[PDB]
Design a protein around this ligand. Structure first.
Ligand SMILES: Cc1ccsc1CNC(C)(C)CO
Length: 211
């Protein structure tokens, strides 16, 4: 086992094959502990979950400081935090996976290369190298800064995202809201008038597939 695993891939190889809450350590530093939810079952496991939508109990219409820090219940609906995502993705080359489920249908998207810049970049998104069944809806968002209502798509849609003008992905939108572009959307899967029931965004080292 690794004493200070830097992500869910290093926490898993530590033997723990059960999805749930684990401690990771940013840069392997025992003073930078972070409790994360690890999805240890999806496509070989080792995923840090950083967004979960599943029941509309949590408010995602939150401010910059809330999106920077993270909020919610890591066992239910939550957002891990942009500062956390920047620090994790700075540790090496990470891959993004998005799992979607709605009325029994499932889809996914994986991106070879996923990073989140620091606060000076307004947490700039990098997403490249798409594969999957959901359709490449993140390409639209590639290179965009993060936006919240207080830093206007976030206001007009009542969510938060790496908005452009405005979105093909809105996983932090209003739960159960089928009004055009207001809901939990993945446009190239279910369009803008269909709020998705279940959505997770998660990350692990891109080299995990052959480590
Ligand atoms: C195209 C694609 C989509 C998901 S994983 C993936 C492959 N990535 C590698 C292994 C070639 C480089 O890390």
């Amino acid at each position: 086992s690794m004493p200070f695993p830097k992500d869910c891939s290093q926490a898993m190889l530590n033997g723990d094959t059960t999805s749930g809450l684990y401690t990771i350590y940013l840069n392997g530093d025992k003073a930078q502990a972070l409790e994360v939810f690890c999805d240890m079952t999806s496509d070989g496991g080792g995923w840090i979950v950083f967004l979960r939508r599943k029941n509309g109990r949590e408010n995602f219409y939150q401010n910059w400081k809330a999106y920077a820090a993270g909020f919610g219940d890591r066992r239910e609906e939550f957002w891990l935090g942009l500062d956390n995502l920047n620090k994790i993705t700075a540790q090496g080359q990470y891959e993004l996976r998005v799992d979607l489920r709605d009325h029994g249908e499932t889809a996914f998207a994986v991106y070879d290369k996923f990073s989140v810049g620091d606060a000076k970049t307004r947490y700039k998104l990098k997403v490249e190298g798409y594969s999957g069944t959901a359709g490449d809806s993140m390409a639209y968002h590639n290179g965009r800064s993060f936006s919240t209502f207080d830093k206007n798509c976030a206001l007009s849609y009542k969510g938060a995202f790496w908005y452009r003008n405005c979105h093909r992905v809105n996983l932090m939108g209003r739960y159960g809201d089928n009004n055009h572009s207001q809901g939990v959307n993945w446009f190239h899967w279910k369009g803008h008038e269909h709020s998705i029931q279940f959505a997770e965004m998660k990350l692990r080292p891109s080299n995990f597939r052959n480590l």
